[PDB]
Structure formats: C-alpha cells, structure tokens
Amino acid sequence: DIVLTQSPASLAVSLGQRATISCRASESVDSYGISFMHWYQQKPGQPPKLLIYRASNLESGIPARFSGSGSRTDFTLTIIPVEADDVATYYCQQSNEDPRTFGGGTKLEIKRADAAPTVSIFPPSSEQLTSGGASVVCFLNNFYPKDINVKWKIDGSERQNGVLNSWTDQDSKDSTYSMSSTLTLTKDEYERHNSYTCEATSPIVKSFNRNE
C-alpha cells in the first residue's frame, strides 16, 4: 500500500516556537498536479479534526497558525507560534489512491521548565478495608518532565509489584503532567506493617503510620 512515514514520532517544542512535522509518502500522491495529502489533529479522547487539505489549504475555522506545504512524496505541517493547547497527535493521510492510508502520527509536547510534583498520600479507606483489600494511593500532581521515578517503601523496605502507575496526558493549560501510583496489597499484608511511604525523584517523600 502507500506507506506514510512521519517524523519525528514525538516533537518537543517551546511555547511560541515553531513546530514542523514531516510526512514522507512511498510514492507520489499527486494527480493532475494536485497533492492529495491531508493533515488531522487528534486530541486525547477526541475524534480527529481536519486542519489542512490538499497539502496547503487551511480548513474553515482552523487558526492561521497552522499551514502546510510540499508535493509529490514530501509534506510538512507547520505550527507557528505553538500554543499550550496544540498538544495532540497529528496525522498525515493520502487519498490519491485506494486504500487510503495514514501516517503513524506525531505527538506534540510542550517543552517547559522543570517542576517538582506536589505529592499526597492516602491510606486505604475504611470502606475498602471492610472487604479484604488494601490500596495505598499516592498522587504526584503538576510536575515536569513526564519521566519521574516513584518508589514505595513499607517499613522502609522497597516494594514492587502490586504497583500500578497512571499518567495523565500533558495539561492543555500549564503543560504539566500528573500521575497516580497505587500500591495494592491484601488486607492481611497491609495490617502486618506500620510505616507506608511514597517517594518521587533528592526525592519528594510522603509517609503515614497505620496506627496514627
């Protein structure tokens, strides 16, 4: 089929700077001198939305910060200036021949200043304890960059697995991430130990004592 290769896979760009995303096709997608290549934006949890059609035509209602160019096999999408709410995956797609095919996508992330997470720890609720399960939850909120280490310790000794970590997508307003880290144990095992710690990396540390 016609293969569409986008680069890069992930593009980090500062607010106000230019983003440029390439799509190369494995053959010309021109007919009659017209390039049948389109660009879509897809926000997390949302359907795709057309930005640019026939390589360079700005779709009605899309800001002029977006533009496209190229022909034959080589296309670029440009965003200038990049704004905090442009975080999304951008897809190129050819309609010159059947079957229609799409590139693999490029994720836009916003480069911004480092930020320590705000860390909050929560013991198992007493409702949950009445059912034989114990989950200890740690929230790490509003931090940057995305790659943070989270460690659990029980009475000061490190524990994995029963650990489940879930990141949000990059925030469309402040360009931060948050994540939750949940330590799931049996109620029996939870109540054999006193001291519970979550640590995010010098690490930011939250603990509680089960008896206090």
């Binding site: 997390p44 609720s125 929230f139």
Partner: protein, 217 residues
C-alpha cells in the same frame, strides 16, 4: 452544524457480531460518501471502506473484506457498520467520517463521535467507590474506583460544579478489571466546612454512587 452521531460502547463476545450506527444531521445525507476508519488503542488509524447513500455504491480495504459490512438506511439518514467473527484484534475505536471535496480523492471533513468496541467473554461488573480523605494553603482529596468492567465510568466532583483543580487518571486493567482514580485540590478553607462529593456512574451496570469525602479519625 454537520453532525455524525455514533452509537455507544459495545461489549461483545468473541466470535459474535456487532453492528454500530452513525446518524447524520445538518446536511443532505444522500449527497455525501460515508467512510469508516478503525483506531486501535489509541495509535494507528486504518481505512476500512465507504458507502454512497445516494445510490448505494460501496468499496473496501482488502484487509477488511471478510470482517466489515457497510449499509445505509436512507430514510433515517443513518450508516451502519457490522463487524463479524469478533476477536480481541477487533477491540478498537471505530469512526464514520464524511468525505468532503468534490471528487473521489476528497479529504475527510467531519469525523463521527466514535464507537468503542470491547471484545470479551467477561461479565459486566459494577465498581466499588472509595473516598480518599487526607492522612498548608491547599488540600487534596481523592476518589478511587475499583473493580469495574467494561469501560467507561464517568466521575465528577460535586455534580460537575467542581471542575477546577481536578486530575482524573486513565483507567488501567488489574486482574481483568478496571481501576481509575481522581484527585481534586481546593483551598484549605473550603473543605470540610463545604462538602465535597465524588459522583461515579458506570452505565453498563446502571450504577450511580455519590461518595462524600469525610475527615478521617
């Protein structure tokens, strides 16, 4: 407004069939080709096929030839896609999309709201909802939603009136069951004096639960 309203999420069993709909409004349904596209969590988009409602003509990706069937009901402006012999490779989001432009090589100008298909033997399971109260200027509370299937649940704070300062984390599978959590951070003078309640709905089990977060101890 051009609208392509797709049917709601389906949990369906391996080997069976599923049929999903796309009701169009805001244009003359029979003047436009309707295409279908698959998006597997939550990466690649793949073109499936098309149908023209005006006359009835249709075409397929070779890949989907034995898998998908496209139909229309002209009188109610609705396109249907039926997927057969389901496997877990069919678990995906499916889009209908209207072809724009003046010819066969037209771009997609409007995308449908998406239908999520989950292919699984597992039974519908209602979540347990647990309030997470704390152990300076700001206080952070939580809501833990554990043990449901299938996706989705919806979680709000104070019926949705509290939307500022909320982080709702993507669900993950543990032991064939989903878990999600949500945090809300408010000013220290707000709670407990003002009540804060997690609202959780899991339509697939017709369950709705409101959990007030109370001070511990």
């Amino acid at each position: 407004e051009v609208q392509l309203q797709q049917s709601g999420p389906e949990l369906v069993k391996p080997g069976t069939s599923v049929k999903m709909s796309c009701k169009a409004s805001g244009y003359t349904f029979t003047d436009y080709y309707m295409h279908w596209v698959k998006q597997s969590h939550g990466k690649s988009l793949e073109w499936i096929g098309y149908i023209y409602p005006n006359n009835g003509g249709n075409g397929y990706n070779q890949k989907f030839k034995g898998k998908a069937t496209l139909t229309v009901d002209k009188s109610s402006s609705t396109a249907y896609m039926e997927l057969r012999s389901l496997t877990s490779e069919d678990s995906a989001v499916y889009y209908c999309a209207r072809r724009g432009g003046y010819g066969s090589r037209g771009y997609f100008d409007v995308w449908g709201t998406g239908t999520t298909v989950t292919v699984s033997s597992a039974k519908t399971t209602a979540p347990s909802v647990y309030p997470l109260a704390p152990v300076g200027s700001s206080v952070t509370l939580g809501c833990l939603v554990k043990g449901y299937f299938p996706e989705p649940v919806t979680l709000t704070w104070n019926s949705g009136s509290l939307s500022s300062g909320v982080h709702t984390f993507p669900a993950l599978l543990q032991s064939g069951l989903y878990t999600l959590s949500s945090s809300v951070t408010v000013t220290s003078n707000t709670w407990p004096s003002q009540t804060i309640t997690c609202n959780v709905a899991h339509p697939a089990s017709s369950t709705k639960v409101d959990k007030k977060i109370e001070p511990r101890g």
